[PDB]
Write a protein that binds this ligand. Structure first.
Ligand SMILES: *[C@@H]1O[C@H](CO[C@@H]2O[C@@H](C)[C@@H](O)[C@@H](O)[C@@H]2O)[C@@H](O[C@@H]2O[C@H](CO)[C@@H](O)[C@H](O)[C@H]2NC(C)=O)[C@H](O)[C@H]1NC(C)=O
Ligand SMILES: *[C@@H]1O[C@H](CO[C@@H]2O[C@@H](C)[C@@H](O)[C@@H](O)[C@@H]2O)[C@@H](O[C@@H]2O[C@H](CO)[C@@H](O)[C@H](O)[C@H]2NC(C)=O)[C@H](O)[C@H]1NC(C)=O
Ligand SMILES: *[C@@H]1O[C@H](CO)[C@@H](O)[C@H](O)[C@H]1NC(C)=O
Lengths: 533, 537
């Protein structure tokens, strides 16, 4: 019997599994229960801590995926399926996973906690692309990822009611962070050196933990990839949440908050999923029904407000974007777009595309967007129009929110490092015109190119190893730079003035200025003043 | 007595003077009365045509300049004095000038009619830089210029009243234009080939004649230099006109606010002309050169709608138009009010002076609008670079007041039938006395169009003389044929028409013609397409 695979946590005993990598074995503990299953009466409720068990919990395989819509846009296509659930769906899904070196560290080891994206309507910790084994082996950290409830199960809110308070998915994440505080030491992890990182909605989640004081004492450093708590898609107000919760009820045959929630609890999970996407008239991936609610509790004010009022001395943040943040999203609602042709669009389509990428704003506001993003020497060139709408969508939802976060955190005391990820994966199944699409830096951070059963190049393995080092450096010291390394070019902190960031791809680090400063001035400075008066 | 200097017009007989030019002799008739003097009871009234006279009127020198404010910003400085009045001020000023070749043309000749600028508060046809002699000698055209009333005397309006109807300055111009149709044939000019041209307020004036049917009969082609009727400064609404007229009246003790129009105007008529001029600039709280009190009024008479509206609604087939701007339209204006500016230093302004400058140069807009302007003109990678800020404030003022109005006009005329030719004048004069940072300022293409470098007593370079001759050729070609291009010259670079799509224009300087696209297209999209929509909601 292998002693290294037996661990005792506060709730009881676990048996893990040894995993192989090209660099040696790694210990893994998969599908560890950290909450009581949020089913029946516990649906829509905050998570209850897992009650202690007797005997040995089998932790050798991934557990169920939280209930979510399954994307059927391009069935069988690698580019979409790689994000789809790869275990059966279940409300019994609150499990987390621990990877650790083999044999287990005997001195305290820095901990990385991963939070997946998926727009708050999907995601799972078991996707192949979030495989912890290569990071752990190469950089000898402990790595933890959790599942958290999404869609209505995670973020349906009837503000003020105890039957559906909202943000319980965020609370799932917090419970896992509490779990890591109490138990990571049993795996060799140092609970005083926890680094959060996430992508997209995961990045937004990280940011919200930064801004919610009960979470802030559960981790030390943060990494936000292609996402930010202050993006226009990541939060909803109390009044609008109540409307949305009520609309979902009517759509599924449900009629007093107590009576409403009780009825929702009688409906099968699949029923709620099937109506989730129909609660808003113009509902898309950038305007989903059930997202984090600003209700004074988890978030005392809006993330914009909390950021501006914050004192962020003592915080190191790693933030960044991919080269083409908007391109991926265009095939999910923008007219004229497909992965199977060049997606050259007409100006009429461009104007319509703008109302989709920037939903629920006045005609005046939409007019300003079209003004800024039209080349008036070439107002109707189809190739330029495709790039422009990609930029509109990318800048409004990802780049400029991240740029704002970086700027404000820096000016208010955080040490910030910014990057733009510019390498297109040799294995990328999306079309050439999409460039470096949203979410395709992840496989490199997790070192998936080291898996020889996949078809990355020798250059890409070296590239992946660089990135894992930057990330792990940051997790250990708060500085991505090779702690002592003279001649290799240095990654400078991002500041509100100089606005310096580095480009990540096969070439060495290149320092540049401005995360699309001209465009982000439009989105971050002017356009809000417009939407008011 | 010489027979070339004797001409009979409908009013009676005239005697002119023979002018020496470097390239030859020219006949000139300066100071022809085309209207009864707008004195006493006729102050603020439309011009009455000049009553016939017996005997011979000597048209041998420039007549008086219409009453106006005299710029004292930089006394003795040639850059400002060259625009100031160079005859005595008088309300008795409605005279025009004719230049014609020597000897008088035997077959009908193209007529260029010049309208001076000066923001509707100043100007005169007698300024040295408007001397018709070189254009006439070099290109064999008839050149005509008129005086027209300015400031309160031309444009004080109490709309609806008969005692101060408004736009009388424009009516002065129209009367001069009618005079040309009746009498220019007597000088060998062809009344069916008349080309209006003007600069700044002169260009705006030309544009308003385009949009006013009674005037539209009196000419055939148009040239608009650095100005347009849709500019934010060139017109005013009826109610605002009345408020301004009433305030001026109040500031001079009339009556001893508002009341009967007849009594109010009658009281105004008893004030000495100079008194009106001295109070004229204090009607508005923050008054400037791009916001003068008395300008043309939109009242349904001379202009049936706003110039913007009349343009869009217009059918301009059969019309040829030549339009343009100088390279740095906004710089000249910055030393007349903007914080941190002077002709005597580099005028490197701070971020705060820039924000303050925007409010001055784009007057009376909401804070939202002022914000929008600051956004578009800030380089957010270098938000506080004083040189860049200076350039940007110059661009703000220039784009708002000249370039984008001219661009809107060009595009809309081209789309709706007119053949349009467009230029950017990029040459800085060697004799220029304004500081080097102003680049090519507003109004400094005029001396080249009028061929002033050919005057030996001025110290231009030989290249500038060549250049002046090129421009005179273009303008005169446009006048003759409706196309500034060299008839039957093939190897010479061609000047293509301006259209809404291609947006092509040529650069004019010492080098040959370079064709370019877009008259500050990105900036003007902002000023012409978006910024009005924001003022509504
Ligand atoms: C590029 O493709 C889009 C998407 O259309 C789909 O994908 C194509 C490869 C082809 O298989 C089509 O038959 C598919 O429907 C085109 O946009 C569609 O245009 C059709 C035209 O009738 C319209 O009915 C659909 O609603 C459009 N779909 C979307 C999402 O807008 C687009 O026209 C193609 N570009 C071209 C042909 O230049
Ligand atoms: C650039 O000049 C302006 C104008 O000031 C005048 O002209 C100068 C060339 C010099 O002769 C000054 O002494 C003159 O007063 C300066 O702006 C003025 O500054 C003074 C004092 O600081 C102030 O009282 C005025 O109100 C200012 N006028 C305006 C229109 O803003 C400006 O500071 C100069 N810039 C320099 C010297 O860097
Ligand atoms: C103004 O007063 C005059 C002088 O008596 C008078 O004739 C005229 O009718 C008055 N105007 C109006 C509009 O009543």
């Amino acid at each position: 019997e292998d002693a290294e695979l037996l661990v005792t946590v506060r709730g009881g005993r676990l048996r893990g599994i040894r995993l192989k990598t090209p660099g040696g074995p790694v210990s893994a503990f998969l599908g560890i229960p950290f909450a009581e299953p949020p089913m029946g009466p516990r649906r829509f409720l905050p998570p209850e801590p897992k009650q202690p068990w007797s005997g040995v919990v089998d932790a050798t395989t991934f557990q169920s995926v939280c209930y979510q819509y399954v994307d059927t846009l391009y069935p069988g296509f690698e580019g979409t399926e790689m994000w789809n659930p790869n275990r059966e769906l279940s409300e019994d899904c609150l499990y987390l996973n621990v990877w650790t070196p083999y044999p287990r560290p005997t001195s305290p080891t820095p901990v990385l906690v991963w939070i997946y994206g998926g727009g708050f309507y999907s995601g799972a910790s078991s996707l192949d692309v979030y495989d912890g084994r290569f990071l752990v082996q190469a950089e000898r950290t402990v790595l933890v990822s959790m599942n958290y409830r999404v869609g209505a199960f995670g973020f349906l809110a009837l503000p003020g009611s105890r039957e559906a308070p909202g943000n319980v998915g965020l609370l799932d994440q917090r419970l896992a962070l509490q779990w890591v505080q109490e138990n990571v030491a049993a795996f060799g992890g140092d609970p005083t050196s926890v680094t959060l990182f996430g992508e997209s909605a995961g990045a937004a989640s990280v940011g919200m933990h930064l801004l919610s004081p009960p979470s802030r004492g559960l981790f030390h450093r943060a990494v936000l990839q292609s996402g930010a708590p202050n993006g226009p898609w990541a939060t909803v107000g109390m009044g609008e949440a109540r409307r949305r919760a009520t609309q979902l009820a009517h759509l599924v045959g449900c009629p007093n908050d107590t009576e409403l929630v009780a009825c929702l609890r009688t409906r099968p999970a699949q029923v709620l999923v099937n109506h989730e996407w129909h609660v808003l008239p113009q509902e898309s991936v950038f305007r989903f029904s059930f997202v984090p609610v600003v209700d004074g509790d988890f978030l005392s004010d809006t993330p914009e407000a909390l950021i501006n009022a914050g004192d962020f001395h003592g915080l190191q943040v790693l933030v960044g974007v991919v080269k083409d943040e908007g391109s991926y999203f265009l095939v999910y609602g923008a007219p004229g777009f497909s992965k199977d042709n060049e997606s050259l669009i007409s100006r009429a389509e461009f104007l319509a595309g703008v109302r989709v990428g920037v939903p629920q704003v006045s005609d005046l506001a939409a007019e300003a967007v079209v003004l800024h993003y039209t080349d008036w020497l070439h107002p109707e060139d189809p190739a330029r129009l495709r790039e422009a709408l990609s930029d509109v969508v990318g800048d409004h939802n990802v780049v400029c929110p991240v740029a704002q976060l970086a700027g404000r955190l820096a000016a208010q005391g955080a040490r910030v490092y910014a990057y733009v990820f510019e390498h297109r994966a040799s294995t990328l199944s999306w079309p050439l015109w999409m460039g470096v699409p949203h979410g395709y830096e992840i496989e490199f951070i997790f070192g998936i190119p080291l898996d020889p059963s996949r078809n990355y190049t020798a250059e890409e393995k070296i590239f992946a190893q660089r990135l894992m080092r930057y990330w792990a450096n940051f997790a250990r010291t708060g500085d991505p730079n090779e702690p002592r390394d003279p001649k290799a070019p240095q990654w400078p902190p991002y500041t509100a003035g100089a606005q310096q960031y580095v480009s990540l791809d096969l070439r060495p680090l290149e320092v540049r200025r401005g995360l699309r400063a001209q465009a982000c001035a439009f989105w971050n400075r002017f356009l809000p003043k417009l939407l008011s008066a």
